[PDB]
Design a binder for these strands. Structure first.
Ligand SMILES: [Zn+2]
Ligand SMILES: [Zn+2]
Lengths: 99, 1333, 90
DNA sequence: GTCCTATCGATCTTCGGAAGAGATTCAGAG
DNA sequence: CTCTGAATCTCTTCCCGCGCGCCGTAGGAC
């Protein structure tokens, strides 16, 4: 099985998982550790923002790849924002900071 | 939004109202027939956002032309529907409600703040009893909870001069009444009022909480929820299923319950329901909010199915299925796939074959990017269609796109970094992924149906990073040790072993060949045999010291196979490497030497050529295996027939009563073991002897070409323990309880095993399988703990400038050395000027890396101890200096600045975790060091040291031997005698501990009475007895306080004094003693007064890293001086340690059953052992120093791997140790603003003391505290990493009340927020950002 | 094609800085593509960059030199355009 | 039959997990 | 009379991918 682009999950916009569904392989925590074992940071940033989570970014990446530019704009993984809402639904005010 | 920090704190109710866009009132979402969202519900359109993409619900506007306007037919605002997933609402509770988290954390934060027990606060909150507030002129305290009968009393005893509320309202009034700062000042002065250390510690916790609440902007009532925000609906969809039904949503139902209960409460309060009813409704509402928040912390979780409890918000936050480990740290990625792998031997080391279909389905956009660029397709609409058409031109497009684009291959489970690698792909017709043979070792990839995944790197930097860091050819050395990961495969080594072997008489023997090429031609013409002995003119190149090859040619006596192989070895090596029958060991070093000399680029091609030649000539070998090849030595039947008979004799003794039960067992099993050894030796000898050949005359034997023998000897598969079971005897077995079977499995698999033998074998087989299945999980858990404790460390500076370090010596234990010095010290930098053996002459500079040449130079000298810099001792704040870490084991040079050492070390420790188990010898010179003995009747050292250990400078002046001569041992071989191996060095009583005197003189039972302190035993064996001393437990104070003493007496009133010593020869007796030298007996020096008679694999390291205290704590003595007893053992004994200049009464309670290494007058020091058994890493650090605890940890964690044969570089452990003691506890607050006694991060305390001493003010004094990994991971100052690990429901409150702020330093936090990690190329970017600032 | 990158690593004394420099050069050669300083072999810009580095004709300093000079040329054309605009208005 | 409100608001939720550590209660005595 | 020991309670933790298969609010009132 192999997946380029297809269905995306609703609560978090990560791609679906499975064969009967047009899903992609899960990049587990052990794989993240192995990538960090090398100095690969751009690889990780792509793998966890553009390929999977940042909805606006993964389209601008698609356009650049078709255009032959091969440059990504990571933005921010939507799942993290979901987490923030999930914590903000409690009595916790967690927020980003400028400085 | 761009950000640089994350701040967590309590949310004020008006802040919640600021979050909200509306107040949800009706607990309905959508109609059950129409799919429109009901207004003022959980899915209200005007509250959270419109459902339609860009249209309002009422349909008044369906265009961007009306974007941002407000309709008045339904009330929904028209904009992008995505905002619907961001807007929140809020429910205004009809009455206050306590936040469940803050009520029932590990401590009770609300309880701690009010200093009110959790049981009582819970009793109040659930409306069980009143609590008096503003008690005024009443005998009712500040809180003073009171029951309903008590309230009924107060209702008439007093009027309204008291107020007694119920539930959270009373707690809110208490919170609203908290004069926090004045309270903290009072408690911090009351702290000095008492020393109750069973209360001072919790008082420090309470004041710390008060200070944290004072400093933060948080206010007490914020612990009580008043407005509960609702999650945006798009995060909790009511998705439909097959048919007109919508899938059940847990949070939606929890919110529905809460809304219904609260609306009922409002209705009643409007209609003035009686107090009892409203109290019950308020209790139900509080419990429903509890179920919404942290369902399960209630008495019982609610469910809407077959007892499947509903997941709450806190359930969605934490857990293995929670967001943190399910969606943030690891997320599914597009442009990836998986397939079943297969071996393609034709591939180069840097290539991999992928199916055409997978390539087309992964590189689709790149193909579009060519169809437009080629102009062959109009746009995407036609490009996708053409790709679907699988046009023959599309394959030319794919063959052009895929030309130089790496693909990542990732078998899972990827324990170590070598499990993910980049490969240049090549199209293959089939559907399996073609993998290279030499790489499969790194993946641990057996091709018996093993799936593997591919990921396509898209951006430019990703491609470059794959080619530069993750390429197969860039990972030829293992990062865990100086070991190649391209170690030749099982089949290839068999081929080389078969090719280079030599036979006595063979075709084409003895001639002269003019060169390797002519040899090869001869073989291919069939005129010569491969194993034929021949003389070929060989030519070799050796690069000089400067680096230019020098050609030398000679005639060489060798074999045809070796001459053929020499055509592949590169032009830099000596012929002596190929002039031997190569095996999995001998070849490996060969390859390593190539990497040592030629370089990476020659090495990779040499490895590929070795693989090719090995495969070809192994195919030519045709080394089949058959039943004819398993040989049973003919003598075996006799070896059985005798050995069993011997057991019969051991049985006959048992048949005669001449032996005990156990002795029969331990004689039979030993005889069977000896028989098994004899059978195995005869079988091996026959296997090697089975070949004898005629060399032109007279038969001569030689090494055997038996298939099994070549498989075993080449090291491919099937070692001695396998061939022994296949051709010797299966041998003994063990029961599930571990007992050795008295009747071994006398058969071997070539012969048939009978039914009982097989049933016996099943015990071991299933035990091993279950061991594997259970240990495969604990290994992974250990890996996770290691990565989450060490994720932070990165080499972020070149030189720290420190000069300390740790001294490396060869491991000498159990006599002979178990590992050399070179292994320890290779690849580190010197701590200070290495010196020449002798005096006043240095040998190596003070900060030079000890690479291979300097390691050889040191081994050339007699240097045993070398101090080298270590990662633990580096003085770099929030990072590690490069010089301490030293060599990058995967590169050979010093480690670059920016590498994430922490994850590498964690993987290095955790990779072999599935290999563990979850269930005088040579002549030398005598070097007693640590000697604290005296002299006896021979003077052979009256061993008075619980330390003395004699070492052994070898014939090369090298300590190759040493151990601990126990107290009371007699040193036969002492004072530096030279003694040969096997000649008794010293003697000991293996059963009892003897006590000995120093002087020779008369004695009396001083202050001893028969019956009171000794028992008049008879010694029924003879009738003449040695008196038995009464214990402290077998006698009361009339015998406990009458402690036995055997003080030596003389006519002068004092004993012969040692110069400068006034101590009389006072000696005593402990319990269980047996003493013969009674009153009137002359005891000589060295005479024994009396005698007193008396582990794991993976867990042994898992508990070591967690720093668990031992079940049997070997008590180490502290400070110094001479020990004493206090009062005797009642409940548990009490002792005292006296230093004249020191705590003369350093007291300490002691267990009774633990025998003591000191009795009443033994000189003691900090760390001195009072009892045997394992020590405590915490105590070791506190008493012997950081270097000492580091050495203990490294050696005791290496003794587990050395036993199991796993080799891991010692440095990989020290990094973890650096993480364990990253915290320090303040001793004196000093001029620092730190608390009097507090645990602060050691980096912060060190930097503060640095600037303070720079200004000349009193720097803080601290003790570095050893925290176990499981806790040190959660103890960090960055709450995101801790909360991502475990106990999130606790950390997310503890940090909340503290008003914590995260700087996002570290790898895990940056991975969560989706930015570049502060390591590698990310470190380069961050460093550029900080330098350009 | 490149099987190893050891020579460039010896040139740019860091495994990581080589990645970033090659990223800079290959990005230049790809979008607004400057022609490379090495004969092509139908390669992707990535490998061509790693070809140029091994020839020792591209690094951080050289790229910064080129960038600064290119910026100066772009500012120089600005002065001529501003002056010509000022002359034409009179 | 469809459409509504609500949870064993006259039970018994499973005993066949280890363990590891804090927290919370209780002794022998100063 | 309550101070340091233990002693008993609750809370939390347990490798990782793949691939199916099925199953998925309830009772009673208008
Ligand atoms: Zn509308
Ligand atoms: Zn350092």
């Amino acid at each position: 099985h192999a997946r380029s682009t297809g269905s995306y999950s609703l609560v978090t916009q990560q791609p679906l998982g499975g064969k009967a569904q047009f899903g992609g392989q899960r990049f587990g925590e052990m794989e993240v550790w192995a990538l960090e074992a090398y100095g690969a940071a751009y690889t990780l940033q792509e793998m966890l923002t553009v390929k999977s989570d940042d909805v606006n970014g993964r389209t601008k990446m698609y356009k650049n790849i078709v255009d032959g530019n091969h440059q990504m704009e990571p933005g921010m993984p939507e799942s993290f924002n979901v987490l923030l809402k999930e914590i903000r639904s409690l009595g916790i005010n967690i927020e980003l900071e400028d400085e | 939004e761009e950000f640089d920090a994350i701040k967590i704190a309590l949310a004020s109710p008006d802040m919640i109202r600021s979050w909200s866009f509306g107040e949800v009132k009706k607990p309905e979402t959508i109609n059950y027939r129409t799919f429109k969202p009901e207004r003022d519900g959980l899915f209200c359109a005007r509250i959270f956002g419109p459902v339609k993409d860009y249209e309002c619900l009422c349909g008044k506007y369906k265009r961007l032309k009306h974007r941002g306007v407000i309709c008045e037919k339904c009330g929904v605002e028209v904009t992008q529907t995505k905002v619907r997933r961001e807007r929140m609402g809020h429910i205004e509770l009809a009455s206050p409600t306590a936040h469940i988290w803050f009520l029932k954390s590990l401590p009770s934060r609300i309880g701690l703040l009010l200093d009110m027990p959790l049981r009582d606060i819970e009793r109040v909150l659930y409306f069980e009893s009143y609590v008096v507030i503003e008690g005024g002129m009443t005998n009712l305290e500040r809180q003073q909870i009171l029951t309903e009968e008590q309230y009924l009393d107060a209702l008439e005893e007093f009027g309204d001069e008291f107020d007694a509320k119920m539930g959270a309202e009373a707690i809110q009034a208490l919170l609203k009444s908290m004069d926090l700062e004045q309270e903290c000042e009072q408690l911090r002065e009351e702290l000095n009022e008492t020393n109750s250390e069973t209360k001072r510690k919790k008082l420090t916790k309470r004041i710390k909480l008060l200070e944290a609440f004072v400093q933060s902007g948080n206010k007490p009532e914020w612990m009580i929820l008043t407005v509960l925000p609702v999650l945006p609906p798009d995060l909790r969809p009511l998705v439909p299923l097959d048919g007109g039904r919508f899938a059940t949503s847990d949070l939606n139902d929890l919110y529905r319950r809460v809304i219904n209960r609260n609306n009922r409460l409002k209705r009643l309060l409007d209609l003035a329901a009686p107090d009892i009813i409203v109290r019950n409704e308020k209790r139900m509402l509080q419990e429903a909010v509890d179920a919404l928040l942290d369902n399960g912390r209630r008495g019982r979780a609610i469910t809407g199915s077959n007892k499947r409890p509903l997941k709450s918000l806190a359930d969605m936050i934490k857990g293995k299925q929670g967001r943190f480990r399910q969606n943030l740290l690891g997320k599914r990625v597009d442009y990836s796939g998986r397939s079943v792998i297969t071996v393609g031997p034709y591939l180069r080391l840097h290539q991999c074959g992928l199916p055409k279909k997978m390539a087309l389905e992964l590189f689709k956009p790149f193909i579009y990017g060519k169809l437009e660029l080629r102009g062959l397709a109009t746009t995407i609409k036609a490009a996708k269609k053409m790709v679907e058409r699988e046009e023959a031109v599309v394959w030319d497009i794919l063959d052009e796109v895929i030309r130089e684009h790496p693909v990542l291959l990732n078998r899972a489970p990827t324990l170590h970094r070598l499990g993910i690698q980049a490969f240049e792909p090549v199209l293959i017709e089939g559907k399996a992924i073609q993998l290279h043979p030499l790489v499969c070792a790194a993946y641990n990839a057996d091709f018996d149906g093993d799936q593997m995944a591919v990921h396509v790197p898209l951006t430019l930097e990703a491609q470059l990073e794959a080619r530069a860091l993750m390429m197969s050819t860039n990972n030829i050395l293992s990062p865990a040790n100086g070991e190649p990961i391209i170690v030749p495969s099982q089949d290839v080594v068999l081929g080389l072993y078969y090719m280079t072997r030599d036979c006595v008489n063979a075709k084409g023997e003895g001639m002269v060949l003019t060169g390797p090429k002519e040899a090869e031609r001869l073989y291919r013409s069939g005129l010569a045999s491969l194993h034929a002995r021949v003389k070929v003119r060989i030519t070799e190149y050796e690069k000089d010291a400067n680096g230019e090859l020098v050609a030398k040619t000679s005639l060489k006596d060798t074999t045809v196979g070796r001459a053929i192989l020499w055509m592949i070895v590169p032009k830099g090596l000596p012929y002596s490497i190929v002039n031997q029958a190569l095996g999995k060991k001998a070849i490996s070093k060969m390859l390593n030497t190539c990497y040592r000399i030629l370089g990476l680029k020659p090495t990779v091609i040499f490895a590929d050529q070795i693989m090719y030649t090995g495969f070809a000539y192994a195919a030519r070998s045709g080394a089949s295996v058959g039943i004819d090849d398993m040989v049973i030595p003919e003598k075996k039947h006799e070896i059985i027939s005798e050995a069993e008979a011997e057991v019969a004799e051991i049985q006959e003794q048992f048949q005669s009563g001449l032996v005990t039960a156990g002795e029969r067992y331990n004689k039979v099993i030993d005889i069977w073991a000896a028989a098994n050894d004899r059978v195995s030796k005869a079988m091996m000898d026959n296997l090697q002897t089975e070949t004898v050949i005629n060399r032109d005359g007279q038969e001569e034997k030689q090494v055997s070409f038996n298939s099994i023998y070549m498989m075993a000897d080449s090291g491919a598969r099937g070692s001695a323990a396998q061939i022994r079971q296949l051709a010797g005897m299966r041998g003994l077995m063990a029961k599930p309880d571990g007992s050795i079977i008295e009747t071994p499995i006398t058969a071997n698999f070539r012969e048939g095993l009978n039914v009982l033998q097989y049933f016996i074998s099943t015990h071991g087989a299933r035990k091993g399988l279950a061991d594997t299945a259970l240990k495969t999980a604990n290994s992974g858990y250990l890996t996770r703990r290691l990565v989450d404790v060490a994720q932070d460390l990165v080499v972020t500076e070149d030189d720290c400038g420190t000069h300390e370090g740790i001294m490396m010596t060869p491991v000498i234990e159990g006599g002979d050395v178990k590992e050399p010095l070179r292994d320890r010290v290779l690849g580190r930098v010197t701590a200070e000027d290495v010196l020449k053996p002798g005096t006043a002459d240095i040998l190596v500079p003070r900060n030079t890396l000890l690479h291979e040449q300097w390691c050889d130079l040191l081994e050339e000298n007699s240097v045993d101890a070398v101090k080298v810099r270590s990662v633990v001792s580096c003085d770099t704040d929030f990072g590690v200096c490069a010089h301490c870490y030293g060599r990058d084991l995967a590169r050979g040079h010093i480690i670059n600045k920016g590498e994430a050492i922490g994850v590498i070390a964690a993987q290095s420790i955790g990779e072999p975790g599935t290999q563990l188990t979850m269930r005088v010898k040579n002549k030398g010179s005598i070097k007693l060091s640590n000697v604290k003995s005296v002299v006896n009747s021979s003077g052979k050292l009256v061993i008075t040291s619980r330390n003395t250990e004699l070492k052994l400078i070898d014939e090369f002046g090298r300590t190759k031997e040493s151990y601990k001569v126990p107290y009371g041992a007699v040193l036969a071989k002492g004072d530096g005698e030279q003694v040969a191996g096997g000649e008794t060095v010293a003697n000991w009583d293996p059963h009892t501990m003897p006590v000995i005197t120093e002087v020779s003189g008369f004695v009396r039972f001083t202050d001893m009475i028969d019956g009171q302190t000794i028992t008049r035993q008879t010694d029924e064996l003879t009738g003449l007895s040695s008196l038995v001393v009464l214990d402290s437990a077998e006698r009361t104070a009339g015998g406990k306080d009458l402690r036995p003493a055997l003080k030596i007496v003389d006519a002068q009133g004092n004993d012969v004094l040692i110069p400068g010593t006034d101590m009389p020869a006072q000696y005593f007796l402990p319990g269980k003693a047996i003493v013969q030298l009674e009153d009137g007996v002359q005891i000589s020096s060295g005479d024994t007064l009396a005698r007193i008679p008396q582990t794991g694999g993976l867990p042994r390291v898992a508990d070591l890293f967690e720093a668990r205290r031992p079940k049997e704590p070997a008590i180490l003595a502290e400070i110094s001086g001479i020990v004493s007893f206090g009062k005797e053992t009642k409940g548990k004994r009490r002792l005292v340690i006296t230093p004249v200049d020191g705590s003369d009464p350093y007291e300490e309670m002691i267990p009774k059953w633990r025998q003591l290494n000191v009795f009443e007058g033994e000189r003691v020091e900090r760390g001195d052992v009072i009892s045997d058994g394992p020590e405590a890493p915490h105590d070791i650090l506190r008493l012997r120093g950081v270097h000492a605890v580091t050495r203990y940890i490294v050696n005791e964690v290496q003794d587990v791997y050395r036993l199991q044969g796993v080799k891991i570089n010692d440095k990989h452990i020290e990094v973890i140790v650096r993480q364990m003691l990253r915290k320090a506890t303040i001793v004196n607050a000093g001029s620092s603003d730190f608390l009097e006694g507090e645990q602060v991060e050691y980096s912060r305390v060190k930097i503060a003391n640095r600037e303070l001493e720079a200004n000349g003010k009193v720097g803080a004094t601290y003790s570095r505290d050893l925290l176990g990994i499981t806790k040190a991971s959660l103890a960090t100052e960055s709450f995101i990493s801790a909360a991502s690990f475990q106990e999130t429901t606790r950390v997310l409150t503890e940090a909340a009340v503290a008003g914590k702020r995260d700087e996002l330093r570290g790898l895990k936090e940056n991975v969560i927020v989706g930015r570049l990690i502060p390591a590698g190329t990310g470190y380069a970017y961050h460093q550029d950002r900080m330098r350009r600032r | 094609a490149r099987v190893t990158v050891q020579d460039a690593v010896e040139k740019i004394g860091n495994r990581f800085d080589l990645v970033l420099v090659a990223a800079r050069r290959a990005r230049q050669m790809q979008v607004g593509g400057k022609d490379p300083l090495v004969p092509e072999e139908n390669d992707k810009t990535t490998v061509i960059a790693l070809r140029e580095i091994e020839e020792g004709l591209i690094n951080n300093q050289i790229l910064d030199v080129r960038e600064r000079q290119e910026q100066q040329e772009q500012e120089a054309a600005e002065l001529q355009a501003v002056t010509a605009i000022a002359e034409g208005r009179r």
